[PDB]
């Protein structure tokens, strides 16, 4: 009778084919080569397969390669192989919506995973870590862009801010794994990283918008700076209200408490993210989600474990989609060897300066050498925000119909995709490798 590897592979192949077949039967034309749903399904499966395959390979002392690399490569190959790309087409609206949902999921997970006492202690350190390295890297990257690539100063800073914020999608899962393992919990390193990795996005996007407006001489800088400040304020206020609400109302004496709480947090986070994006305040949604989830977890205390488990399953489902879509954004047209060497040089030097700055920001915080080194190497990952706003400058330049500005926007896009590819895999691998060693386990 059936047993062993053959039965498992038969069942998995059957489930995959059956899911596609069911979707095709219900929809029909969407789930066929060229249609949207067929593209989504194929991208999902390819991302999962790539993650697994890359995870398999482990020859050297370094742990198995991160599945992030596999998912990114799957998306990249789907985008760039000619015929596969022609057949597998995903509508932009759907891709953006799925990526937004994945971001909301991970932000909720991070907010739930925070520790109140650690946050109360590492108060200034979080602000420094969130706002120092981003600014310093933006400035140094602008310098490099002006001198090497030849961009003017405004475009240099646009590039520096695009090549800015760290990615919560990469940092949060690894820090949650480490926190579950108990590494660095005594000093609350995972809490510090998870909290700081969700604020610098606001500063990076604010700087990007301001410098873009300066470059195209549109609107005013004061308006964009005030937009950033209002983003912070309204995000905090809305998150606080929602968190204090869901922290009380689904009561401890209801029939399906876990399900209702999970739906409330996830739905409120999705609503915040999408409505804020649609209302012209992209960045208030993430902060509102973080604060809401933090307050809800603080209120629930022990009961939050089941909600965390369900959201972890949701993230397991959604991570392949997010990273496959990010990879599918990358096009080899922008990675032409015309000047790719200089773009790589600027990205590498900016990353080195970012590492040094991050080490100096957490210097006077009570950490020891190993913890500071781990923190510096855990601030590298960049993704899910370089892909979101990488090509905005190029689109604006095209709208203005200026050739020089198109050239500058193309350099910006090349550098964004470079930074993603270079830093996300190495960053995740370094987090995984250096977690157990440098951090101090608590048992």
């Amino acid at each position, epitope marked *: 009778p059936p047993h062993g590897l053959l039965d498992r592979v038969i069942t998995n192949v059957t489930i995959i084919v059956l899911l596609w077949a069911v979707v095709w039967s219900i929809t029909g034309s969407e789930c066929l080569p*060229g249609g949207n749903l067929f593209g989504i399904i194929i991208l999902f499966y390819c991302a999962i397969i790539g993650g697994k395959l890359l995870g398999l390979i482990k020859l050297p002392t370094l742990p198995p390669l991160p599945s992030l690399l596999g998912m990114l490569l799957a998306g990249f190959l789907i985008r760039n192989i*000619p015929v596969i*790309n*022609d057949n597998v*087409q995903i509508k*932009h609206k759907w891709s953006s919506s799925l990526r937004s949902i994945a971001l909301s999921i991970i932000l909720v997970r991070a907010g739930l995973g925070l520790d109140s006492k650690a946050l109360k202690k590492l108060k200034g350190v979080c602000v420094r870590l969130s706002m120092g390295p981003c600014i310093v890297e933006a400035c140094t990257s602008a310098l490099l862009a002006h001198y090497l690539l030849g961009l003017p100063w405004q475009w240099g800073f646009i590039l520096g801010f695009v090549l800015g914020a760290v990615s919560p999608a990469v940092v949060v899962p690894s820090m949650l794994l480490l926190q579950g393992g108990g590494y660095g919990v005594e000093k609350g390193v995972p809490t510090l990283l998870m909290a700081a990795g969700s604020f610098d996005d606001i500063l990076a996007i604010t700087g990007f918008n301001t410098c873009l407006g300066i470059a195209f001489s549109t609107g005013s800088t004061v308006f964009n700076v005030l937009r950033g400040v209002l983003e912070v304020v309204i995000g905090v206020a809305t998150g606080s209200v929602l968190g204090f609400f869901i922290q009380y109302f689904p009561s401890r004496d209801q029939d399906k408490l876990v399900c209702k709480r999970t739906f409330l947090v996830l739905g409120l986070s999705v609503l915040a993210v999408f409505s804020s994006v649609h209302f012209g305040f992209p960045g208030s949604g993430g902060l509102c989600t973080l604060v809401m989830a933090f307050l809800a977890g603080m209120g629930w205390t022990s009961e939050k474990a089941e909600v965390e488990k369900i959201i972890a399953v949701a993230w397991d489902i959604f991570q392949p989609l997010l990273f496959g879509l990010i990879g599918a954004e990358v*096009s080899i*047209a*922008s990675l*032409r060897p*015309e*000047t790719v060497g200089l773009c790589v040089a600027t990205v590498g030097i900016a990353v080195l300066i970012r590492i040094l700055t991050t080490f100096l920001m957490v210097c006077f915080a009570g950490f020891n050498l190993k913890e500071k080194i781990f923190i510096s190497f855990a601030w590298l990952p960049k993704a899910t925000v370089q892909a979101a706003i990488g090509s905005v400058a190029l689109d604006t330049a*095209r*709208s*203005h*119909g*200026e*050739k*020089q500005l198109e*050239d500058y926007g*193309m350099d910006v*896009l090349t550098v964004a995709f470079l930074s993603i590819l270079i830093t996300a895999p190495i960053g995740s691998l370094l987090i995984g490798l250096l977690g157990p060693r440098l951090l101090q386990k608590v048992e």
Partner: antibody, heavy 121, light 108 residues
């Protein structure tokens, strides 16, 4: 090889509308910009507008803003242009050329064959 | 706009000489002065992108000199094939504007 083939010669009456077709083979269709150029006989060329067959965004010369309408279909790998309320001044050869949007020295470098449009009664 | 002007609309040239085509813009395009060739049968092919960047597959005779706002195109030696109409384009600004064109006519 790369080739763009467009519809054949057309005959129309004043005030009517015509659909131009430009189909390209030999390259990733959604990887390039499709530009339209109108050459009236005797006179020189003059740019009309372009369509991005990736997100279907367009840009039009101010002169043809409203007179023309660009569309594309990825599955058929073809692009179409609509000329509305044709007059005596809209009878000329129409070209379609591709252009790499993500190259610092982009140009057209690949044109159609020319689709004469005649607006007579 | 950036209406371009080609000084000579029809210049004679033998079958073994070097000819020059002059294109002058009504502004300062940095170097975005593509060149095009249209043959009498109506087929138009790119020749020179970005002033002097010879295109791929173009014979080495075509030399796209010129800079500033007074560009030019040169033919090393003239072959019977090179008898056609040559347009100078500009993509520096939004509305791309072609030149008036020039026709090469064999001397006799």
């Amino acid at each position: 090889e790369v080739q763009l083939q467009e519809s054949g010669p057309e005959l129309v009456k004043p005030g009517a509308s015509v659909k131009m077709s430009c189909k390209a083979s030999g390259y990733t269709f959604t990887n390039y910009f499709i530009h339209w150029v109108k050459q009236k006989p005797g006179q020189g060329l003059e740019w009309i507008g372009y369509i991005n067959p990736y997100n279907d965004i367009t840009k039009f010369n101010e002169k043809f803003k409203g007179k023309a309408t660009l569309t594309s279909d990825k599955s058929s790998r073809t692009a179409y242009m609509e000329l509305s309320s044709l007059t005596s001044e809209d009878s000329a050869v129409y070209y379609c050329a591709r252009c790499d949007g993500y190259y610092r020295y982009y140009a057209m470098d690949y044109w159609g064959q020319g689709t004469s449009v005649t607006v007579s009664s | 706009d950036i209406v371009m002007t080609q000084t000579t609309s029809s210049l004679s040239a033998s079958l073994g000489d070097r000819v020059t085509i002059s294109c002058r813009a009504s502004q300062d395009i940095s170097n975005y002065l593509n060149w095009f060739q249209q043959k009498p049968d109506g087929t138009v092919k790119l020749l020179i992108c970005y002033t002097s960047r010879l295109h791929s597959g173009v014979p080495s005779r075509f030399s796209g000199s010129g800079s500033g706002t007074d560009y030019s195109l040169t033919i090393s030696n003239l072959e019977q094939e090179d008898i056609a109409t040559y347009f100078c384009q500009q993509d520096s600004k939004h509305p791309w504007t072609f030149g008036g064109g020039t026709k090469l006519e064999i001397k006799r």
